[PDB]
Design a protein around this ligand. Structure first.
Ligand SMILES: O=c1ccn([C@@H]2O[C@H](COP(=O)(O)OP(=O)(O)O)[C@@H](O)[C@H]2O)c(=O)[nH]1
Ligand SMILES: O=c1ccn([C@@H]2O[C@H](COP(=O)(O)OP(=O)(O)O)[C@@H](O)[C@H]2O)c(=O)[nH]1
Ligand SMILES: [Mn+2]
Ligand SMILES: [Mn+2]
Lengths: 239, 239
């Protein structure tokens, strides 16, 4: 079993670094695979590898894997379904950070789990996925990628069209929102109804969905991201 | 089995009237019980009864029931759990309208079903409830009403505290969002991402949550409510 993340542009390297360090800080008991697509330049890969080196130990491995871009690079994330050298993958977007150990996600008996999106709340968000790789399912995703329209023009819309009965699936396949707590809800509710956000307990993964990404541009959640990132740079370079 | 709605203030009488007529227009095959609490004046009850009279027939009955207010009248809705002269109740807020026949809701084998709220999407909204009445459960709701805090200060917060594992429950107990399509999502997404709202298919019950209520004060959904209400007044008085 492994955690996996994805980088398809040099500009997201700071997101990966914050995520890597948040997993290190949470003492996760499974290795991490960083997928990087063709558009990520080799110097950025080398920089990322150097940043991760001080977090490597005999008890935690961070590995790197080249993957081809999957165009609509908008579908490159589908590569997690082909990683069948692993029985189970916990995939996390590079614009998320882990606040608490989430190793229990590997205890879910399902081939596919995701957390609900906020709009609408009976569809799922594709930023956190717990999957069991299967190369035949991967092939059919690739094939259907040229047929199924996506209501958000991205991988979330496409995956919901491919798994339209996710909402009806068992509890193992539907992650609580605390495993993919999207800052878009915080932005909307914090000023008037902050109690809606405080209801999300435990809050284990923060997802910095929508734009700009925190490294691209001072809300409370963005302060938290920079706290994680700057500590990561401090510990990687000085620790 | 029956549909049920609730009025706890004279000012919501226009909401009840739009809802009653939307159920009539959808040709629902089960009767409707209108709960009215003590604060609703007798003349308003009489007006409502006269408005409903032309929709009464040998094949559809609208009945009225006095219920005592349940204070925190904020918990008066809990009275649906005591209606054990019915095996099953589909409860709908008076600020909703039915756009399509929803008689299939009575085919769900569960004691309690609700649709997800938008914030957060792993809690439920209490505006549409499919329940099997049970006077012992009612007693425990009343008892716990003096103990469990509500994260929104209302019945939705309280019922989520009472049923905190709703998200983990079976598909029968978790209604698709189309059975409680809250206009708050439309307000937020229509301008920028209208495709999120169009994903809600079928859209069977529109819930005019938040304020002001349409009869209290010209968005697209509010135009739709007034279309339903004004046709209802036309057919009740002229049809
Ligand atoms: O320019 C990009 C866009 C996407 N990604 C990767 O694809 C994931 C999904 O994209 P994104 O998080 O920006 O979408 P959102 O969550 O805002 O819908 C990102 O987290 C990254 O892992 C990336 O590396 N560079
Ligand atoms: O002043 C009121 C408040 C509530 N209600 C009844 O209680 C339900 C729930 O209240 P409301 O719909 O206003 O709450 P919201 O959906 O906006 O959270 C209403 O639909 C009515 O059935 C009412 O009759 N008068
Ligand atoms: Mn993301
Ligand atoms: Mn309501």
């Amino acid at each position: 079993a492994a955690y996996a993340t994805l980088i398809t542009s040099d500009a997201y390297v700071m997101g990966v670094e914050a995520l890597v360090y948040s997993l290190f800080k949470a003492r996760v008991a499974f290795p991490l695979v960083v997928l990087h697509s063709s558009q990520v330049t080799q110097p950025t890969v080398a920089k990322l590898t150097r940043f991760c080196a001080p977090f490597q130990s005999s008890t935690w491995r961070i590995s790197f894997r080249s993957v081809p871009d999957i165009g609509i690079s908008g579908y490159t994330k589908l590569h997690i379904f082909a990683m069948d050298d692993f029985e189970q993958i916990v995939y996390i977007d590079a614009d998320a950070i882990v606040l608490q150990n989430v190793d229990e996600l590997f205890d879910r008996s399902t081939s596919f789990a995701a957390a609900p999106d906020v709009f609408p709340p009976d569809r799922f968000n594709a930023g956190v996925l717990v999957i069991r790789p299967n190369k035949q399912l991967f092939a059919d995703l690739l094939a259907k990628a040229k047929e199924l329209k996506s209501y958000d023009g991205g991988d979330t819309g496409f995956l919901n069209a491919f798994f339209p009965k996710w909402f009806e699936s068992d509890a193992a396949s539907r992650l609580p929102f605390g495993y993919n707590a999207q800052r878009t809800m915080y932005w909307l509710v914090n000023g008037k109804n902050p109690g809606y956000w405080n209801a999300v307990q435990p809050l284990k993964i923060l997802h910095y969905s929508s734009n700009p990404k925190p490294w691209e541009d001072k809300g409370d959640l963005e302060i938290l991201w920079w706290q994680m990132y700057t500590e990561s740079r401090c510990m990687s370079f000085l620790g």
